mmCIF file of C-alpha atoms in Angstrom:
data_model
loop_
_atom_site.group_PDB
_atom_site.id
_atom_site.type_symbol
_atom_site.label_atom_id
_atom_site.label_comp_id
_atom_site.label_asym_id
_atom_site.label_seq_id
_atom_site.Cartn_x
_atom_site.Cartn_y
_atom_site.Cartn_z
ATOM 1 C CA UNK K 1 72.189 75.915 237.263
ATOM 2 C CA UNK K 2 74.850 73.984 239.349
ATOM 3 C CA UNK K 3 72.848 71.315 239.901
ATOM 4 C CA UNK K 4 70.173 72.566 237.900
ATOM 5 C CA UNK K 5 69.193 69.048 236.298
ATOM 6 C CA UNK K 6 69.584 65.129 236.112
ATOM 7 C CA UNK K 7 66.999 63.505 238.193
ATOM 8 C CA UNK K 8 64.369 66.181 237.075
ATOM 9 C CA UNK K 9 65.560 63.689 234.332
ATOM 10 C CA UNK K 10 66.744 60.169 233.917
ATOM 11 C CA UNK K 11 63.808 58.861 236.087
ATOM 12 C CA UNK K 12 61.392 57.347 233.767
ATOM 13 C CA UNK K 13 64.108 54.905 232.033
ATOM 14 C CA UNK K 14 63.140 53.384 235.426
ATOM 15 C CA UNK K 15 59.540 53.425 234.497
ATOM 16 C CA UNK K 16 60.599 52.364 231.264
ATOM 17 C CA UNK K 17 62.291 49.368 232.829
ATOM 18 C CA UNK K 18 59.149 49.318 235.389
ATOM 19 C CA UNK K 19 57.093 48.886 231.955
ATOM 20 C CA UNK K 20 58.963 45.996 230.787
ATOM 21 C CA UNK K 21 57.627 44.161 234.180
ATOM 22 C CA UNK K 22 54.436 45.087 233.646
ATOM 23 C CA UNK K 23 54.641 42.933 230.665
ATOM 24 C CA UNK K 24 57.732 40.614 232.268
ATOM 25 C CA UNK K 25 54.403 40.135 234.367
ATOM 26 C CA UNK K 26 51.534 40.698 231.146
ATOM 27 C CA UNK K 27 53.187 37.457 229.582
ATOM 28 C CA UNK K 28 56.886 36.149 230.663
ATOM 29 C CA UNK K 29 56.923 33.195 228.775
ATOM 30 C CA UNK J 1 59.836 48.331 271.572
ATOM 31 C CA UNK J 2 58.313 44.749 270.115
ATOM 32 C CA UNK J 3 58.376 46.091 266.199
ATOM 33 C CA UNK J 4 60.142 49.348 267.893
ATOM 34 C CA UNK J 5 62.310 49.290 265.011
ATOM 35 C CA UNK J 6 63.820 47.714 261.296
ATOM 36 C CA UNK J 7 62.339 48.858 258.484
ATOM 37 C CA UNK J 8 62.740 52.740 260.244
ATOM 38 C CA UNK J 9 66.349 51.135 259.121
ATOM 39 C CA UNK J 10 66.863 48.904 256.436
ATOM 40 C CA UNK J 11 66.085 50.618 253.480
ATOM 41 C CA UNK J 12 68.659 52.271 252.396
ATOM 42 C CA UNK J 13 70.458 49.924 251.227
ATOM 43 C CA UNK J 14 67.502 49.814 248.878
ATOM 44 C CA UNK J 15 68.325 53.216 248.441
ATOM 45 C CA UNK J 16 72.609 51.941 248.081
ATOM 46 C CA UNK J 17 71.196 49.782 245.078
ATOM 47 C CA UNK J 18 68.707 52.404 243.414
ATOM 48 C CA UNK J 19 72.476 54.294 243.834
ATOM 49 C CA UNK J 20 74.485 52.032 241.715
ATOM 50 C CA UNK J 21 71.552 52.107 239.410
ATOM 51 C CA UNK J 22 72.295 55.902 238.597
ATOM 52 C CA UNK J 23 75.558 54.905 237.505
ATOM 53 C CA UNK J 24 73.989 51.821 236.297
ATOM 54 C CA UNK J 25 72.922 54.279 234.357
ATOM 55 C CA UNK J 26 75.450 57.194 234.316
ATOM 56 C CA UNK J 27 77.906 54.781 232.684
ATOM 57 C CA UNK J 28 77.057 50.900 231.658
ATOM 58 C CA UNK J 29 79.822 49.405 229.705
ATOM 59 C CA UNK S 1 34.548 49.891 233.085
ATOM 60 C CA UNK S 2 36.879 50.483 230.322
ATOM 61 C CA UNK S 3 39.917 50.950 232.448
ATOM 62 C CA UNK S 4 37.783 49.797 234.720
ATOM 63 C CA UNK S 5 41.099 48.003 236.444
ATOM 64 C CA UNK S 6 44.716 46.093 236.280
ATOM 65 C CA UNK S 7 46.583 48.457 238.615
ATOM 66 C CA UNK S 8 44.067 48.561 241.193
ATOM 67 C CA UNK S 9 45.615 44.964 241.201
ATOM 68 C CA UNK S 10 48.967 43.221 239.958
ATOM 69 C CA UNK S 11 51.078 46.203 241.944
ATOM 70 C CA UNK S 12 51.386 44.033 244.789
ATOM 71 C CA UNK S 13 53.346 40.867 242.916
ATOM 72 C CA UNK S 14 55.872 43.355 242.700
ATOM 73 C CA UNK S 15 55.472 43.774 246.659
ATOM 74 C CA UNK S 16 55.638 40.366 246.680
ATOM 75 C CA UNK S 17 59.381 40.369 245.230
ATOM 76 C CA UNK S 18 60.217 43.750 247.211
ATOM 77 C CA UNK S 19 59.339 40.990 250.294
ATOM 78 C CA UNK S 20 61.797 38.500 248.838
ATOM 79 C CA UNK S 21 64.471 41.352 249.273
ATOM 80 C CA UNK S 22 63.872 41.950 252.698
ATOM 81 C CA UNK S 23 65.044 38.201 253.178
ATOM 82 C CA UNK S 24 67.468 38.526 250.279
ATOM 83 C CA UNK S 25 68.379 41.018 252.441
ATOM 84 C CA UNK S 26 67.631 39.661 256.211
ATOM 85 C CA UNK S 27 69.764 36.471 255.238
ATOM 86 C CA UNK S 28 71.294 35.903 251.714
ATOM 87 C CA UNK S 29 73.450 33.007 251.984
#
C-alpha cells in the first residue's frame, strides 16, 4: 500500500550499473 | 579503544551518496 | 570447472576502489 513499493524495485539498475563494471573491469580499454 | 571506533561511523555518508543515487535515479535531467 | 570461478575473485578490485573512498573520504583535498 502506502509505501507498498519502490526499493522492492529500482535496485537492480544498480546491478545493472554493477554489470557494466564487471566488464568496465572484463575489458576497459 | 585503539581501533575502538570509525568505520562503526563513517559509512553513511556512503549511505548519503547511495541517497542521491535514488534520486540519481528518481529524477536525472 | 565450468563456472569453476571469476567471482570467487575480481570482487575485491572493487574493494580496492571502496578503499580509495575511505581516503577520498578521510582527506579529499
Amino acid at each position: 500500500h502506502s509505501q507498498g513499493t519502490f526499493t522492492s524495485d529500482y535496485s537492480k539498475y544498480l546491478d545493472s550499473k554493477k554489470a557494466q563494471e564487471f566488464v568496465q573491469w572484463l575489458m576497459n580499454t
